Specification:
Length: 136
Amino acid sequence: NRQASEFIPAQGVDEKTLADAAQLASLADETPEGRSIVILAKQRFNLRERDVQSLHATFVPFTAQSRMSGINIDNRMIRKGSVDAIRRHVEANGGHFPTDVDQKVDQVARQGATPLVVVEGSRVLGVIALKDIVKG
Ligand SMILES: Nc1ncnc2c1ncn2[C@@H]1O[C@H](COP(=O)(O)OP(=O)(O)NP(=O)(O)O)[C@@H](O)[C@H]1O
């Protein structure tokens, strides 16, 4: 019962950029929430999912244990998942989680939203605040 409502760029990132990466990196996840995000950009930008096999790219399945899904393509890599999840993905690449992005994820949470974090390759492009359909 979770849907993306808004995306916010990381330090120095454009908001359209964050929404776009969350959409294609969610095409590979089979979770209903990954569709919730692909909608978020749809209404905001009115765009369509990107075909991975038309780019000869690859989908990255979403697993709950790491809480992460993404997509790979012949010129880019995208990953999105839990804040702890994305921090571990950046460190494995050898990237770093910018404070500004950690602050956006926390304000997403303190506001009652579930902040997901999205990065390109090993760097965070922005964070996503989701509304919870069901209230705890
Ligand atoms: N399309 C998606 N791609 C990548 N991650 C997602 C996607 N949709 C949801 N997520 C994250 O994956 C989490 C769900 O996986 P899960 O491991 O069951 O977490 P959870 O235990 O239910 N939540 P929490 O208790 O806060 O860790 C969601 O809460 C989101 O933060």
